[PDB]
Structure formats: C-alpha cells, structure tokens
Antibody, heavy 220, light 214 residues
Framework: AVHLQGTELVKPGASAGVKLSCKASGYTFTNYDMNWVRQRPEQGLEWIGW???????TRYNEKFKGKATLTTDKSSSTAYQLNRLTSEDSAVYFC?????????????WGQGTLVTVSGAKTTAPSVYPLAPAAGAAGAGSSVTLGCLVKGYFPEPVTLTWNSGSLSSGVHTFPAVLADLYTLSSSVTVTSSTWPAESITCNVAHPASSTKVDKKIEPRG | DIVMTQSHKFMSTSVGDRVSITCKAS??????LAWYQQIPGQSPKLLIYSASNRYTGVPDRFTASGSGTDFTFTISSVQAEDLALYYC?????????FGGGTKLEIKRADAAPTVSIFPPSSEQLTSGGASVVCFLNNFYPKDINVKWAIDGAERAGGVLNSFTGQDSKDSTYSMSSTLTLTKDEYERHASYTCEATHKTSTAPIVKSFNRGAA
C-alpha cells in the first residue's frame, strides 16, 4: 500500500515562497528518490527534480534552477518543495516516485498540491442577473437566463438555480482569474415558463461567508 | 532537451472502438518511454513503462509500442472511462520531458451552438462596470471561433472566455464569452455583437443588441 500524501493548497502572495510537503508511506522512504512535477493549464507537465533520502541530495531541471531547491527529511519520511520567487508559479505540484528499480517511470503519485499566487485579499463576489433584453422571453420556444459572478477571491463559489430545483439545461463555467475570480452560469427553460415561474441563482462564497440569491427579472 | 510531441491535442473516438495516440520524441530515447492517463482533478496514472510494458493492474485493452523516435499508445476497445488525457514522457536522459497530452473525446452528431447575448445589468452599471455576456451552448464539434464586434469593429481587448469539457451525458461542449468594459467606454458605443463561427452553418451565428434599444 505505497502512498504519497501531499499538502493542502495554499495561497501565497506574489512575492514570497512556500515549502510544500509529501509524506511517503508503505515503503522504506530511503530506498527510493522522490521527484516533483509541475502542471500548469497552458504548459502541461514539467519535471522539476529528484531527491535521495539516503542522501545523494538532488539534481534539478535546467528550467527550475534556483526557483526550486528541493529538500527532504528522514525520521518522518516526508519530502519538501521550497518554491522560491513565486508569481507565475501558480499551478498544481505533484510528488512522484518510480515503481520498479530499473525504470524512471513514475508509478506512484501524490494527489497534488494547488498553489495560487495573488496579492488580492478575501473578497465577496458581486452577483449580476442576466435577462434577455427588454424582458420578453426570447423569440423561440426556449429562453436562456444567466448569472454573472465577479470580483471574488479566493476560489471557490458554489452556484445553483432555484436552490437546486433547477438543474437541467444548466451550464456553469470554470472561473477565470483577473484579480477577482469571475464566472458565469446559464439556465435554459421553456419560454412560456419565465417570468411566469421565477428563476433565481444562488451563489455562495465560503471564504467570505456570503451568499447572494439574485432573482432574474424582465428588464428594459 | 528532448521534445515529446503529441500532434493531436484531441482525438475523436467511440465506445467499443479502437484508437491510437501517437508520440514523437525529438531524439532516439530508445525504449525509455512511459504513458500516463489523467482524469480531471486527479494525478497522472502510469499505464505503460519502458515503451511497451503494461504496469500492474492496467487492463489488457491498453497497449503501447515503438522504440526509437516514434511511439504509439493504443486502446483495443474504448470504454466510457477511457475518455481522458494521456501523456507521453521520455526518461532516457534528463531533464525528463512530457508530451503535451492527448484528450480522447466521444464523437457525436454535429450540433449547432445555441447563442445568447446579455447586456450589462443595471446593478453592475451602478458600480461603474459593464460586462456583456455571450453563451454558446451544447455544440459539437468543439471547434468554434468567437468574435466580438463593437459598432462593427472587432474587439479583442477585455474578452474573457471559459468553457466546459465535453459533457458526459450529451457529449457536447459549451462556452461562455464575456466582454468586460468600464461603464465609461460601454456608454460610448452603441452596437454590441457576439459572433460564433461553427461548421454547422455557412454563415456565422450572430447575436446583438443596441444600447438603450429594445
């Protein structure tokens, strides 16, 4: 039962560094070298470097020169990832180990640790109702309403329609950065049912303890 | 640095069918190559070690071949849970490098996007903000081009796009495109258009509205 337990996600400021953790278990920690891999949405997976707990120290990837100076510690079988500068280092970092003795392929991986670099502070989201121009209800047999959530930090926010009773025809999209995470959701129902049968989006933001239930109404 | 190239970011397949992902190492990495699979929000899973060896527990449907500069991952008969990302990785000489990955997706009937455009809400305008939102939902193939036009001229500054992966139920894709201006600039223009170019129609799908005009 080989297992690698990584650390919870952290939100460092665009300036300092953060030491990540990886608790190996189920095998003699010193018998295998630990590896670290980075994964960003646009650049894919990139190997960072390895470490020998038996002590052969390290060997880093050219690209992660001093921005990543690994370290470890026996008597606890945990490996650490320093992360120096940090600013464009926002991504998920993995802890990886190989399986057999003669293949550098990574058979064992940690669950990964998300790292977000931002100077923003906890901020409640503004929620904006999206209704078809001039109220009405479209021009077909179906009408689409929406909810725009922006200016919040940090992730995440939960969004439902009519307290969850409206789940079909819903499209809720991944939030995108921009100082204040912004996301949106659309709901599509039968034209004759709105505004006859009310529709409200419920947005909740754990970090700020805030919730907003914005009803969607015809507008001019 | 050796460069692993996976020429296909996405590959259309079907359940019960055969599919082959290809990888091309910039150099002869001999047989030092591994294949990984990854599902959203999870870590990579080793599927193949040393070019063509199944790791333990990896089902017979998964196969890999090649040795030299060209390698190929193959799935005899695709199953629902195989519609994920597969990564190539050479471990011949450091630094270890991974391919860009290939996402397998379910092929289905072409479907035109339903496009909806929304003017800024009064509540946002009071805060000095003006976001125009455009939804493009339930379309297939994923290939789509969204353009914004303000008073006719195309606008690229201030556009933020978001999309969902292929739906696990209806195999379509959806997308949101938001044009965010300040109320100051928003009120200095009159015509706002969201234009979707998709293979399902010769003419791009267009949705618009005029400030203050119903």
């Amino acid at each position: 039962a080989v297992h690698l337990q990584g650390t919870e996600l952290v939100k460092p400021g665009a300036s300092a560094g953060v030491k990540l953790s990886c608790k190996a278990s189920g095998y003699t920690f010193t018998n295998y070298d630990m590896n670290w891999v980075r994964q960003r949405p646009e650049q894919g997976l990139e190997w960072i470097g390895w470490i020998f707990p038996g002590d052969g120290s390290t060997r880093y990837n050219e690209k992660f020169k001093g921005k990543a100076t690994l370290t470890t510690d026996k008597s606890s079988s945990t490996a650490y990832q320093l992360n120096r500068l940090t600013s464009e280092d926002s991504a998920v970092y993995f802890c990886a180990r190989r399986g057999f003795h003669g293949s550098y392929s990574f058979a064992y991986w940690g669950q990964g640790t998300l790292v977000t670099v931002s100077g923003a502070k906890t901020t409640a989201p503004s929620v904006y109702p999206l209704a078809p121009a001039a109220g009405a209800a479209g021009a077909g047999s179906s009408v689409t309403l929406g909810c725009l959530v922006k200016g919040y930090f940090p992730e995440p926010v939960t969004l439902t329609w009519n307290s969850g009773s409206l789940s079909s025809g819903v499209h809720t999209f991944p939030a995108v950065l921009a100082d204040l995470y912004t996301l949106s959701s659309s709901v599509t129902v039968t034209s004759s049912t709105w505004p006859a049968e009310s529709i409200t989006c419920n947005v909740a933001h754990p970090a700020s303890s805030t919730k907003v239930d914005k009803k969607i109404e015809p507008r001019g | 640095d050796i460069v692993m190239t996976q020429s296909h970011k996405f590959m259309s397949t079907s359940v019960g069918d055969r599919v082959s992902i290809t990888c091309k190492a910039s150099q002869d990495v001999n047989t030092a190559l591994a294949w990984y699979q990854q599902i959203p929000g999870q870590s990579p899973k080793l599927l193949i070690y040393s070019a063509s060896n199944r790791y333990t527990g990896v089902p017979d449907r998964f196969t890999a071949s090649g040795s030299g500069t060209d390698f190929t991952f193959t799935i005899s008969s695709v199953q629902a849970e195989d519609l994920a990302l597969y990564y190539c990785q050479q471990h011949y000489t450091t630094p270890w490098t991974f391919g860009g990955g290939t996402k397998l997706e379910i092929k289905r009937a072409d479907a035109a996007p339903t496009v909806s455009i929304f003017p800024p809400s009064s509540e946002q305008l009071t805060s000095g903000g003006a976001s125009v939102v455009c939804f493009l939902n339930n379309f297939y193939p994923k290939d789509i081009n969204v353009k914004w036009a303000i008073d006719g001229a195309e606008r690229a500054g201030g556009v933020l796009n978001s999309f969902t992966g292929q739906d696990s139920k209806d195999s379509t894709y959806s997308m949101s495109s938001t044009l965010t201006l300040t109320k100051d600039e928003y009120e200095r223009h009159a015509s706002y258009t969201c234009e979707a170019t998709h293979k399902t129609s010769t003419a791009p799908i267009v949705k618009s509205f005029n400030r203050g005009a119903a």
